[PDB]
User: Fold MAP kinase-activated protein kinase 3 from Homo sapiens.
Amino acid sequence: EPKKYAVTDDYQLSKQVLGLGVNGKVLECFHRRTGQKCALKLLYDSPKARQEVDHHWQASGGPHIVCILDVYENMHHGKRCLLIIMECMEGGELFSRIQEAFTEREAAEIMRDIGTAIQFLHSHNIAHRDVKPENLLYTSKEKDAVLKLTDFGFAKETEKYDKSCDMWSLGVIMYILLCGFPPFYGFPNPEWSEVSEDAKQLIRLLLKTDPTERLTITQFMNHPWINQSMVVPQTPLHTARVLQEDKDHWDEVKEEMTSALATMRVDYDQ
Ligand SMILES: O=C(Nc1cc(-c2cc3c([nH]2)[C@]2(CCCNC2)CNC3=O)ccn1)c1cccc(C(F)(F)F)c1
Assistant:
């Protein structure tokens, strides 16, 4: 099912880059028959790159996951390559949309969306292991846009530990959603003043230092704040203001979280 004829027979490539995904750069392209703009991820062929395509195909179809359209096995400047054609997510990154009222109920909606995605993967015994702001994208800039998760370059077919790393990521994203800075912890006033006890409780249960004590996705999804996301108070939050105000170290917090996820993927630590 990976197509072996040239990707450029089906797609018109452009020289616009969306971003760097560890294995490969991401480029815009256009399907030739339809007009649709799509995203193309170039991976040099390796066991790891083959695992990514495998894990992404398996995940593709689930809720709130960026869909694969085609996969090509091509030669490119004398090197063997896998090209993942994905749907183009032109809404941009989760937290960029947010810094562009933002209530606690809206945050619950978002975390529920991300949770459904992780529920799908985990029930299919796939741990993502790289859930972080720049891997959470919107399909469009419109109001009806759908939040989706990409980047299976660190995904692993499962175990309880690898899954618990995803649940830690949910806690960190939820924390930043609720106030605008990461837990690098406590809940400092005045940002955490009118945030509900259920929100803080859920985050405590996810940010547990001991992975065994950490909530499972199925417990995450059954928590009132997620399960009853539609009756969470419409309480206005500081996040949008805080993000714009602290825009000059957003690259730092992204770098810090990438670093934290990296150390959780190590065989031995301390
Ligand atoms: O990135 C966009 N569309 C997009 C992007 C991806 C994508 C996949 C991967 C990544 N992006 C990254 C880029 C560097 C940051 N990490 C994630 C590395 N690894 C991936 O696996 C997939 C599908 N559509 C986009 C397109 C048009 C406009 C806009 C914007 F909203 F910025 F105006 C964004």
In short: The domain at 89-270 is CATH 1.10.510.10 (Transferase(Phosphotransferase); domain 1). Strands lie at 11-21, 24-31, 37-44, 68-76, 79-87, 92-93, 126-127, 136-138, 147-149, 156-157.
